[PDB]
Design a protein around this ligand. Structure first.
Ligand SMILES: [Ca+2]
Ligand SMILES: [Ca+2]
Ligand SMILES: [Ca+2]
Lengths: 150, 108, 74
């Protein structure tokens, strides 16, 4: 999410205006002014693609933030930007993992953060852990670490 | 503030790995030292060629031994990867914009 | 059991990789080049001699991480 949101923050107004013009083609004639699998399929086929209904549903689900089953303009911008080393972080992961258990816990994160020399607030520590810990177990596993440092 | 994180992650690549490679330049002349051919006569050269060929055999055997351990770890990695998996159980916007909007696509 | 099969397999693979040294027709200059060639072979084997070792260390640990993951998900 975070890396895509940042890309969105950095689109110019004219870029967003052009994307709006494209979005209007997609949603032409849609009941609720949004893109369903019906509109998405129609445009993909117009473009020469032949997605299955499952691929279409998956394209929508990837960016659907309100569980509407449909794509609004904000979700469309994310879809657009989405359209366009590990060995190295594996060695670095090991350096965080001081008790060698295969997870980075809060203590280990704290130790590393203090070692940076920057002034580390409690908020710095809690938010970084929440940012890294996708499955709410309070620690950062290897796959979470890769996304965290992507 | 997270996008400062991406900068420092990029510096860390741009990093330690490079220093470790260098620390390898230091390791390497420490095992394979320079040849000394100057002043060896014909017979001495024949013997050297036999000596080197024998060394080729020995080094290949040592390489094989490390390779065999690597192979056994692959088997273990493949098995553990299956185990943890069980326990845990287009077109670019560019091309699209050109097609839909034609000339009106400039910025995107 | 498993040991004598590993050993005969090792012998077999090393035998297949071995080159025949034929130097008896070579003059002094050719011998110096032959020596350099053999040296380069040793070098290349020593270099592999690693992508060998460095890999092993990385493996020891995406084994340690895996064993933990399993333990923690059991
Ligand atoms: Ca939606
Ligand atoms: Ca740990
Ligand atoms: Ca986690």
């Amino acid at each position: 999410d975070d890396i895509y949101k940042a890309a969105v923050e950095q689109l110019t107004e004219e870029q967003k205006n052009e994307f709006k013009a494209a979005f209007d083609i997609f949603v032409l004639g849609a009941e609720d002014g949004c893109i369903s699998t019906k509109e998405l399929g129609k445009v993909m086929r117009m473009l020469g693609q032949n997605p299955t209904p499952e691929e279409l549903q998956e394209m929508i689900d990837e960016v659907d933030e309100d569980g509407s089953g449909t794509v609004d303009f904000d979700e469309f911008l994310v879809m657009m930007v989405r359209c366009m080393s590990e060995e190295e972080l594996s060695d670095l992961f090991r350096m965080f993992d001081k008790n060698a258990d295969g997870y980075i816990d809060l203590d280990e994160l704290k130790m590393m953060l203090q070692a940076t020399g920057e002034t580390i607030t409690e908020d710095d520590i809690e938010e970084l852990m929440k940012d890294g810990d996708k499955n709410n177990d309070g620690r950062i596993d290897y796959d979470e670490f890769l996304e965290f440092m992507k | 503030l997270k996008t400062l994180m991406l900068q420092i992650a990029k510096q860390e690549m741009e990093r330690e790995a490079e220093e470790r490679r260098g620390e390898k330049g230091r390791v390497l002349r420490t095992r394979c030292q320079p040849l000394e051919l100057d002043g060896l006569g014909f017979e001495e050269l024949q013997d050297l060629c036999r000596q080197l060929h024998a060394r080729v055999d020995k080094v290949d055997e040592e390489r094989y031994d490390v390779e065999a351990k690597v192979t056994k770890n692959i088997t273990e990695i493949a098995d553990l990867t299956q185990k943890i998996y069980d326990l845990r159980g287009r077109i670019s916007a560019d091309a699209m914009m050109q097609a839909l909007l034609g000339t009106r696509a400039k910025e995107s | 059991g498993k040991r004598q099969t590993e050993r005969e397999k090792k012998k077999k693979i090393l035998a297949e990789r071995r080159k025949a040294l034929a130097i008896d027709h070579l003059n002094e200059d050719q011998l110096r080049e032959k020596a350099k060639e053999l040296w380069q072979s040793i070098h290349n084997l020593e270099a592999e001699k690693f992508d060998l070792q460095e890999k092993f260390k990385q493996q020891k640990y995406e084994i340690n991480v895996l064993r933990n993951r399993i333990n923690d998900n059991q």
